[PDB]
Amino acid sequence: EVQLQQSGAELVRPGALVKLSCKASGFNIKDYYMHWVKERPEQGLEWIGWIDPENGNTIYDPKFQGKASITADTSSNTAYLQLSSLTSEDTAVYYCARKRGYYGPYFDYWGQGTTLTVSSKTTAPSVYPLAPVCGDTTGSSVTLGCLVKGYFPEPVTLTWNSGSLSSGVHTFPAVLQSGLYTLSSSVTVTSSTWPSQSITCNVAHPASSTKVDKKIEPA
Amino acid sequence: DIVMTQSQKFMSTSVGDRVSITCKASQNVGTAVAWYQKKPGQSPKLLIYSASNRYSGVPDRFTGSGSGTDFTLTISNMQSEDLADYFCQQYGSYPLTFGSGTKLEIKEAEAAPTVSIFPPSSEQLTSGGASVVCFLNNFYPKDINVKWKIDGSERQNGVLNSWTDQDSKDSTYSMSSTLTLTKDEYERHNSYTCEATHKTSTSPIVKSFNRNE
Amino acid sequence: XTHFXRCRXX
Amino acid sequence: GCCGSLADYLTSAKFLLYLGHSLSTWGDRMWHFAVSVFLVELYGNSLLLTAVYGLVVAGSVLVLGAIIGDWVDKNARLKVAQTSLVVQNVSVILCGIILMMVFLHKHELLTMYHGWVLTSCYILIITIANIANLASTATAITIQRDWIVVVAGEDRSKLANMNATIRRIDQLTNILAPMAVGQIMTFGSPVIGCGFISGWNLVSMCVEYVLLWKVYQKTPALAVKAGLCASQMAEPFRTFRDGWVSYYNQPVFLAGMGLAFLYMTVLGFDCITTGYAYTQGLSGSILSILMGASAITGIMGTVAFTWLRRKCGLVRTGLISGLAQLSCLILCVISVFMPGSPLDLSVSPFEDIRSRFISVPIISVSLLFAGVIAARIGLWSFDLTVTQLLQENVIESERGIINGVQNSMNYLLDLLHFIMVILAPNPEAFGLLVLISVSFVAMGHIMYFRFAQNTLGNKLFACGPDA
Ligand SMILES: CCCCCCCC/C=C\CCCCCCCC(=O)O[C@@H](COC(=O)CCCCCCCCCCCCCCC)COP(=O)([O-])OCC[N+](C)(C)C
Ligand SMILES: CCCCCCCC/C=C\CCCCCCCC(=O)O[C@@H](COC(=O)CCCCCCCCCCCCCCC)COP(=O)([O-])OCC[N+](C)(C)C
Numbered sequence A: 001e002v003q004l005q006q007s008g009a010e011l012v013r014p015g016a017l018v019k020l021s022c023k024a025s026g027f028n029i030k031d032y033y034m035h036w037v038k039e040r041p042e043q044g045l046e047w048i049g050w051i052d053p054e055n056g057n058t059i060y061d062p063k064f065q066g067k068a069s070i071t072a073d074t075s076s077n078t079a080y081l082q083l084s085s086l087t088s089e090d091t092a093v094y095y096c097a098r099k100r101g102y103y104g105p106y107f108d109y110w111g112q113g114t115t116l117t118v119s120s121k122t123t124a125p126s127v128y129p130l131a132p133v134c135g136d137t138t139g140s141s142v143t144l145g146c147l148v149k150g151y152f153p154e155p156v157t158l159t160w161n162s163g164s165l166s167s168g169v170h171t172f173p174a175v176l177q178s179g180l181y182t183l184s185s186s187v188t189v190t191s192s193t194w195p196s197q198s199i200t201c202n203v204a205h206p207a208s209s210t211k212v213d214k215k216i217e218p219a
Numbered sequence B: 001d002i003v004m005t006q007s008q009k010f011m012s013t014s015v016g017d018r019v020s021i022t023c024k025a026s027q028n029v030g031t032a033v034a035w036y037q038k039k040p041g042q043s044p045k046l047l048i049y050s051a052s053n054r055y056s057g058v059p060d061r062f063t064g065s066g067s068g069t070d071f072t073l074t075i076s077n078m079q080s081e082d083l084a085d086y087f088c089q090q091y092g093s094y095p096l097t098f099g100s101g102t103k104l105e106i107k108e109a110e111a112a113p114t115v116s117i118f119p120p121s122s123e124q125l126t127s128g129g130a131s132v133v134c135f136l137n138n139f140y141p142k143d144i145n146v147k148w149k150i151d152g153s154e155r156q157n158g159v160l161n162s163w164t165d166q167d168s169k170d171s172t173y174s175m176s177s178t179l180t181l182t183k184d185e186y187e188r189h190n191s192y193t194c195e196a197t198h199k200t201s202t203s204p205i206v207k208s209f210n211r212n213e
Numbered sequence C: 001x002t003h004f005x006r007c008r009x010x
Numbered sequence D: 001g002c003c004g005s006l007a008d009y010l011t012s013a014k015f016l017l018y019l020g021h022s023l024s025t026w027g028d029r030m031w032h033f034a035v036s037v038f039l040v041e042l043y044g045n046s047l048l049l050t051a052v053y054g055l056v057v058a059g060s061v062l063v064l065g066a067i068i069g070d071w072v073d074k075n076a077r078l079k080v081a082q083t084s085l086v087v088q089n090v091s092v093i094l095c096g097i098i099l100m101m102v103f104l105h106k107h108e109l110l111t112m113y114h115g116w117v118l119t120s121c122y123i124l125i126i127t128i129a130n131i132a133n134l135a136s137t138a139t140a141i142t143i144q145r146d147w148i149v150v151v152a153g154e155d156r157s158k159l160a161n162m163n164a165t166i167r168r169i170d171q172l173t174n175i176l177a178p179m180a181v182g183q184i185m186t187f188g189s190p191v192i193g194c195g196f197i198s199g200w201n202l203v204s205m206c207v208e209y210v211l212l213w214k215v216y217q218k219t220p221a222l223a224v225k226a227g228l229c230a231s232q233m234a235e236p237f238r239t240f241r242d243g244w245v246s247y248y249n250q251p252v253f254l255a256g257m258g259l260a261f262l263y264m265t266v267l268g269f270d271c272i273t274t275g276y277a278y279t280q281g282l283s284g285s286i287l288s289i290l291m292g293a294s295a296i297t298g299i300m301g302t303v304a305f306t307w308l309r310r311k312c313g314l315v316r317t318g319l320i321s322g323l324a325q326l327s328c329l330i331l332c333v334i335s336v337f338m339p340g341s342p343l344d345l346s347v348s349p350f351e352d353i354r355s356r357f358i359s360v361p362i363i364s365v366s367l368l369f370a371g372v373i374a375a376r377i378g379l380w381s382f383d384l385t386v387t388q389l390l391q392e393n394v395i396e397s398e399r400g401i402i403n404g405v406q407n408s409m410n411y412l413l414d415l416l417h418f419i420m421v422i423l424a425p426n427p428e429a430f431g432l433l434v435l436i437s438v439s440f441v442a443m444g445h446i447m448y449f450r451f452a453q454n455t456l457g458n459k460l461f462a463c464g465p466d467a
Helices: B122-126 B183-187 D003-009 D013-042 D047-072 D077-104 D107-111 D116-152 D157-186 D190-218 D230-248 D253-261 D271-280 D285-311 D315-334 D363-392 D396-423 D430-456
Strands: A003-006 A010-012 A017-025 A033-039 A045-051 A058-060 A068-073 A078-084 A092-099 A114-118 A144-151 A157-160 A169-171 A175-177 A180-187 A199-205 A210-216 B010-012 B019-025 B033-038 B045-049 B062-067 B070-075 B085-090 B103-105 B130-139 B145-150 B159-163 B173-181 B192-198 B201-208
Touching (some): A003 A092, A010 A017, A017 A114, A033 A068, A078 A092, A144 A157, A144 A199, A144 A210, A157 A180, A180 B173, B033 B062, B130 B183, B145 B173, D013 D077, D013 D116, D013 D157, D047 D116, D047 D230, D047 D396, D077 D190, D107 D116, D116 D363, D116 D396, D157 D190, D157 D285, D157 D363, D230 D253, D230 D396, D253 D363, D253 D396, D253 D430, D271 D363, D285 D315, D285 D363, D315 D430, D363 D396, D396 D430
Parallel strands (some): A010 A114
Antiparallel strands (some): A003 A017, A033 A045, A033 A092, A169 A180, A199 A210, B019 B070, B130 B173, B159 B173, B192 B201
16 A cells, blocks of 8 residues: 655745655655655646655756755655745645656656645634615515635635525635735525524634624615 | 647536547657546546556546647546546656646536625724625626726726636536725715626626615 | 677687 | 575575576577587588578568567567477477588488579578577567566666676676587587587476476566557558557667667677787687686676666766776777778778688787777676666566567667678778777767756766755
């Protein structure tokens, strides 16, 4: 059973040093070449370089020639990738892969991947729910939305009307603005009971460990 | 170095038929092309190597073909377990390069958006912040045009649009557009409308909310 | 290298 | 420490593979020398039979080598190996029997009819020898490449040690076997020589069969194998074309290209070089000493390759070997424009348009021989590294076809060499030939250089790790 393990969930300030590890189980890295690959959000795969643990020779990509280093440890059967002078444009997912020869046909086994993010500050989420009911026309379709803005370097979890879960709730992907994160979730499965039955949305930020519940009211 | 490009980015298919993905190289690589498959939130896995051979435990519905500069991966009888990304990678010479990738999406009947406009919240206004949110709930085609007209003027500043992914149950798309402005800017206006245009109908759907109301 | 010949023969 | 460890070592796949290879090489070399001597003897000394033999061997090797590489790539392993062994051995036995029988009824058979059966007998001898050579080529490529790669497993040091040991065994057998067979020939009668060859080949057949079966039984990973009139003449053509175009498209094409280019030379211990030395009058004992020095330097080259591959890498080892061989060839080239060298452009190199065959300073020869010996050490290192590269960087489903096209290319470059020897046989015009050979060597290494630049970039000079 061949397995590769990587430490993950790394958050760093710009201009620092980061070290990532890839540990192999079920084989000896001395008999293979170890490659590192980067994947940026909504972008293609990029090759960084490879190392031969037997003697320590390393080949890099000219795009990463002066900012990435690769080392290996045979006794502990581990490979290390070191990055320096990080900038906000370096946030990505990094993969460790195994190759047979100089021109091996394929990467048979990969790693789970490690998420690296470069940020500047931390804060707590702010919720400003708003359900417009001014100038309503039809009460058979009620859509209520809650917007959370100013998240502080973390993913939030939003549950609209946790008492009565519905399949009509859709949460848009979060976006980055002014160094903070924003998101919005709208539920339109209220049908006609929304003007009478009370529905409350609860937003929880685990990094800030803050839970806020707001009940939508008519305008 | 060799630049490896795939023309199609989104490929809308239907269950049970056969699809073909094309990959073209800028040099005569020969036969050193491998095809990988990646699912969202996961790691890529080997599918085809040397453009012809399969890799052990792989279903026989995948076939590789081509040579020279053009290669093709063919899937016969697509199954719901095959909606993912596919990459072509060359190993003819260093440095190694990858393709852009290709999406797969199922077929559904065309639909039209259900627009909705929400006025700025009182709590947000009390904090000196104005936000206008417009939500399009369900619509099949991915492409849609959203225009925000403030005081009879299609402003093109301070607008952020986010589109969700394909729904599993309904196979429909949703979008959310937010316009951010200062409290003074929101106060000094009386007209605000959002217009949505899609292939479903020629006439765009416009929803407005007057400041006085 | 030469797979195929010697000739003119302690 | 001695009772158990030795017994365990002598019952391993590696040792049995070594023993089988040694027996096969011994038999092959003894047969080759016997055939050369006998064909030189029973027929009047002339270049016609030698030229026909060489041409037939070369052309058959090219075409049928591509074909048999394809055939090996599509069957089981034990079946192919056993088949090759039986074919080669039976060919050798029958050929030797016919040879001795003609050696017997020579004059009576010559007087019979109009002498039209001597040509038929020569045709039979040539054909059977060619068949045996083809079978030997097939078994060599399949055993070495496939079985060595599989047995070595995943370790890379073991593969290097196995290749080095195979090369050392080949060198020692090449030096030793002709001397012993010539001694047994001259101490007896041709009946002794032919009977000895036939009996030895038969016993070797039996023992090698048993050894191959034992090795196959010991290693369980050999059983598995991934990937598993008009038309009768069209199919071989399709296989030939597909194999050649597949070889051309491989990413290690240039390395095999350079290795093949390294094969056409006159700067090697061979009949031509020995003839030139005899023309210069260098006796026989000195020739034997020179052969011993050549063997020593070949062994030294294998050791150097192992050490360098352990230390620096694979590509850089090839670069170092090429540089060494080039420097030694430059030393050899210096010898031509020296006093005591019989070279002049006035005499036309071509003298036998349609006829053919159908004191002095001693510094020049000494410089030439020093050059060729050091060239030998460098060449052996380069051959070993290219062989390992080819073994390591080829898909299993095509290890046979690629290696067979490689053998075909190697023999081609050999054939051209033979041609020029026919064109300019004058002892005077030898020096010019030397230049040409050196030139070709240079080209090969230059071509290999390009391969390195395609896999190492600008970091072409760093043996150790970065600091
Ligand atoms: C008149 C003329 C008479 C001639 C007679 C004599 C004929 C002479 C002809 C041929 C013999 C050639 C000998 C080559 C020696 C190579 C040594 C070598 O590589 O070392 C190896 C050891 O290897 C061994 O221990 C031996 C392996 C080969 C055994 C061959 C026996 C042939 C016997 C039958 C002969 C048939 C012919 C019989 C004819 C009567 C080292 O390799 P390793 O151990 O894997 O390396 C790892 C260990 N390490 C890391 C510590 C290094
Ligand atoms: C006495 C000495 C004699 C020597 C003879 C010469 C050597 C002989 C050895 C070998 C030569 C023959 C090789 C096989 C055939 C090649 C052509 C081929 O397949 O073409 C195909 C396309 O081809 C392509 O699209 C690829 C481009 C050609 C690659 C060739 C690589 C050769 C490498 C080797 C480098 C060697 C370097 C050597 C340096 C010294 C199709 O061609 P076609 O036209 O459809 O074919 C049928 C013809 N017909 C249509 C008329 C029926």
